[PDB]
């Protein structure tokens, strides 16, 4: 994706790593089309929560921007306001 | 003959309804008689994740992609048996819509 | 195994690896004894359900037409029905 | 004095009657106060693949094979102990019908 | 290492290679001294149990009578029973 | 900027206690936030061997070796820090007794 959107995400991520539940987020984005079975179960493949976080952002960082977006909007479906606050201004501007 | 591209990605698309409304409450008897999984399979379903309905629901739509060809409208007559006509409908109709529109 | 056999299950390999599940299917060739505890091992150390499938079927190939017969009722036990009718043509018959 | 090739040969041929009938949960117990195993070799047994009892029971059966001459005779006296005696008895009259029946 | 001592080893070297597990015994063979980290990474580092068990074997050949003592004290601390009395009789007393 | 050969010796001297008595629950904010270990040797130890607490006890003791001649004060320190208190004194009271014994 776009340098500032990645610089965003870095700029969030132990701020997202400690209080991200992946299970919903990845029904999102797997919904959505950003994200494969194999990449959602090398994800849940993880022991611990915050491995499971670390790696999914990790992943997300090598995509595109439409794939941020999606993850920016599926903070904001499942209450994640203020995370998804912090990564509102990364969002890639639209065309 | 694996299922076709199109059924898991109708099954990845609506995964978010899936997980949302799907009742697995009846299902197992009926999975198990349309011979979509034996019955260890449907052991390790249902330890899946916490063993919350929704982690069920999940790991089984999950696994679904694995049983052949034809693991997608065998489910969907599963979700007619235990009463659930309304996701069923939805399901069997937007896949009648897939299949007629290529490419 | 004899060439058509063998063959079959490279030609059907990948198809193999997109779906089964080793964990069940092991049992059974284990139960046959067609399969070794070492062999078992060294694909259960994999860490993905593809890979694992890959590295069982690496396994199957350099072995004879009774593991790979096995290896098809295996997989007719297990449910699935269709990849077994796959490598079903290739079934090295009696004479 | 390591275990005889025929009571491996036994444990691998009922690989699937084991991992399907076994009930490791009571067990583990009676495991350790017969000395089959150490503990952190349980709890190690205990977490392998997804920690179901099929799974558990596998890697039992799988590394029981290691505990020597008299490991088979005793992991059934375990199973007798915890009052798995359809299990058990089976297992005692194919150890007997085996080890008479060669050559 | 000495007569007996790895005559008895690899008298018995086929029970020992397919029973044990490196994991449990390297780890007693480190507290007590006879092995070191690299060799233990060496061991580690092997696909399938039985080689892993071969590897460390191999390694045992080549060092001393304390080290045989000491890989009999781990057998038998981890409840190897059998093959610690299959090794019992091979113990030098240098 | 190296560890010495007598924390090493000590490493290994009680590496069966440590293996045994580690919990790494608790350590890894710790043991990043105090420098300890960089991230990559962390995401390291926690897939070394299974997952299982005690070889990721292992692999941690082990990449300890290479972590100066400071990692054990810092190490203990994590230990103390996170509620395992025996096991630092423990630690602390044999490191010394070595540095001691050796004229």
């Known amino acids: 994706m776009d340098a500032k959107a990645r610089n965003c995400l870095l700029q969030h991520r132990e701020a997202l ?3 991200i539940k992946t299970s919903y987020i990845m029904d999102h984005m797997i919904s959505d089309g950003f994200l494969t079975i194999s990449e959602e179960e090398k994800v849940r493949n993880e022991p611990t929560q915050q491995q499971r976080a670390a790696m999914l952002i990790k992943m997300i960082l090598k995509k595109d921007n439409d794939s941020y977006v999606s993850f920016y909007n599926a903070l904001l479906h499942e209450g994640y306001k203020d995370l998804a606050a912090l990564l509102h201004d990364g969002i890639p501007v639209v065309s | 003959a694996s299922m076709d591209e199109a059924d898991r990605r109708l099954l990845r698309r609506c995964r978010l309804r899936l997980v949302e409304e799907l009742q697995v ?6 999975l198990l008689s349309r011979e979509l999984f034996r019955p ?3 052991e390790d379903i249902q330890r899946a994740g916490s063993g ?7 790991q089984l739509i999950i696994d679904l992609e694995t049983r052949g060809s034809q693991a997608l409208p065998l ?3 599963c979700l007619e048996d235990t009463g659930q006509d309304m996701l069923a409908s939805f399901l069997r109709t937007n896949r009648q819509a897939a299949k007629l529109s290529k490419p």
């Open chain 2, 75 to 77: 489910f969907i007559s």
């Open chain 2, 52 to 58: 919350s309905r929704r982690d069920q629901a999940r």
């Open chain 1, 17 to 19: 790593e400690k209080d």
């Open chain 2, 25 to 30: 409450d009846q299902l197992w008897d009926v």
């Open chain 2, 40 to 42: 260890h399979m449907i």
